[PDB]
Design an enzyme around this catalytic site. Structure first.
Site: not given
Lengths: 293, 293, 293
Positions: A45, A81, A159
């Protein structure tokens, strides 16, 4: 030097910033160097816009020393992901120690490390709160993963960076009270993305909603795709799937993860509750990508 | 006794409650004793109502022992969210150890301590997540500071109290995942507030909005005040400031902080991107208060 | 093995899952074994639906080994959010070490442990942020308790489970930045719930709202029930209660807790501020349940 300061300083050189900029947009993320030949692992992402629109987005990798280097998208897996980048002809790379997520226990202290030179990058600390926890993730498709749940804060600042144990080893990839993709699962996906540029996951052609009562708790079949393995296996609507293969299914989230644990082309048992009767069915999972496969 | 319990007990006597009450309102906060003569440091937003409306608000300081003592506002700096109070003729004061925020590293364990006798006061624990992180703060004016970001919880229960290292030294002032004003910056502001009752910051007369693309990322000039140093320096609207003096500017937040790092009356370089061309300009910052200065 | 991993593994066998399922609903929670005869302590809000509607809800207890066993509701106390369950004829039970919450200090490291086999169960870590902190809790009635405030995350995954010190001792029951019911208060409530199946708390018949100004800060009487001890004690509306018995009252939350500290049938002093005058009153608290009681 502090106990966590020592660990954070140990892996700082192996964490990179990932910049994707266009003529009117830009987004930053974190990655981790997992191979000396220049292979960088982030989550899918962070680089979603550059993957879906490569004619307008440029993806660069910023290092701890400040070096900015162009990067190439090797492959991505939205269903876990995960994504792998590649930098060419960069020597003296600090490769990250990859650990074994199967040796991680609840209560182990962890660090959630973001890229040092990131704009809003963070380094948070906590413990492992849960293992093998299914969790759903929101033009990319929605997915559910088993995650190493942690009470360390995961945000846009760390992240894509690594979840680190007290041996400065990568045990997970931070994603999206916080969750991380286990490193053992990351090795499987990355090894396939480097080799073939793609990852093939099993499919059944089922939509499920969650259900929890005294009769049966699990994933209730909400749809069956035409010609799907579930259609040729006898799965009907309103069925309540409680076991996919060798894993019990508590809800729709665990069901999605249990399907990915199956083998493509091999018969697998499915246990449902149909009109009060427990029925055992047999399906042969199809590949989601038949040309790769 | 625990490792954090020992540290929290060490500084408890140097943290005070700050009460500002009127005929129909009241608000509590935390402060820290930084000088034996009775000087207490909090943040400017705890005592905002008593400063703007002194004819109706009374400000008292409650100690660890339970002593309640009237206080006097020495000075405040909304641009750094800092304020200094004064208590008169109180002996045997436990003055807090002031540390060096330039020696703080990412990963260092910290305690965010509130006043012990506060109503909803807290003591939270975490690590340092980021250093020199610009962060915006909401009749006082909005400001942006470099902060010691920490994953320890900062709330109304420990706001104005000290951020403490494992040596029981104050390395920051908790403010407003949590942020604190560095102690080195606090010493500069407090030393000036005690001396002159005021603080003079540089000004340029520029409004900026953020921008992030492949051409140029930084602070885009949204306005130029008439007769401002930027007007006499050649700065135009739609310019994209990327360097203020000796500090690169990533957005509007870093721009506001970079201006405060400049010297008043001294020429300073400004680097902008105007219609695709990099242009280097020269401005002389004005004082925001010309009578103090 | 880590320091927290050792503690979490030590108490894992004494934490259980509590499942309440009906024909169309279900809810999970955590409990702790506090007695070898099969007595399990959770909070009252986990089993609220099974208590109010016992003809349609079944309550089972799932153990660490995976054993599922039916349970019986001994008693509950909504005013302290506590409840006691009972399992029959189960041997070799791992009973939890119960500590002394009066020996807990601010800064002590704690673990918030949920049931290992819970669906969304968690294990979070933090320190004690505050002691004796009144906190309100939302067909059960609203209540206010003194709680051991902690910066460890309390959620639906560890609610009803134990708050654990570094000696693997239970110092609190997790409830609902996070709060826990002190173990000393839990022992009093559980000992009465096992003995009589009920708990009798004092009552006064007063509604209060909060007030904080320079004249008087405390709990302002908003209502007086007819024939209540406050009515026979001379308490009027708009009074500002500042002391209930031997405890100062800062707001409505501390007032509710201070009433529960009183003795039933014994005269107790109440200090109010009526039209600017401090007035000392005397009330005799009634039992909330006159038949038990």
């Amino acid at each position: 030097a502090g106990r966590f300061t020592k660990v954070a300083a140990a892996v700082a050189d192996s964490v990179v910033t990932i910049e994707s900029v266009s003529d009117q947009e830009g987004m930053q993320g974190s990655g981790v160097i997992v191979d000396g030949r220049g292979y960088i692992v982030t989550n899918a992402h962070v680089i979603s816009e550059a993957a879906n629109n490569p004619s307008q987005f440029k993806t660069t990798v910023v290092f701890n020393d400040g070096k900015e280097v162009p990067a190439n998208l090797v492959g991505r897996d939205p269903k876990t992901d995960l994504a792998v980048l590649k930098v060419d002809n960069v020597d003296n790379l600090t490769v990250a120690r990859l650990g074994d997520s199967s040796k991680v226990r609840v209560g182990d202290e962890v660090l959630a490390v973001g890229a040092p030179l990131g704009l809003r990058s963070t380094v948070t600390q906590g413990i492992v709160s849960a293992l093998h926890r299914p969790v759903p993730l929101s033009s990319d498709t929605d997915t559910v993963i088993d995650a190493i749940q942690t009470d360390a804060s995961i945000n846009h600042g760390n992240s894509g960076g690594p979840l680190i144990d007290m041996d400065a080893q990568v045990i997970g990839i931070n994603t999206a009270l916080g969750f991380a993709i286990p490193v053992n699962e990351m090795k499987l996906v990355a090894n396939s993305l480097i080799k073939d540029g793609k990852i093939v996951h099993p499919t059944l052609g089922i939509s499920t909603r969650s259900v929890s009562n005294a009769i049966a708790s699990g994933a209730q079949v909400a749809n069956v795709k035409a010609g799907s393995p579930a259609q040729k296996g006898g799965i009907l609507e309103n069925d309540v799937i409680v076991k996919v293969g060798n894993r019990a299914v508590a809800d729709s989230d665990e069901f999605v993860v249990a399907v990915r644990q199956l083998a493509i082309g091999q018969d697998a048992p499915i246990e449902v509750v149909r009109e009060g009767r427990h029925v055992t069915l047999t399906v042969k999972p199809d590949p989601d990508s038949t040309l790769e496969h």
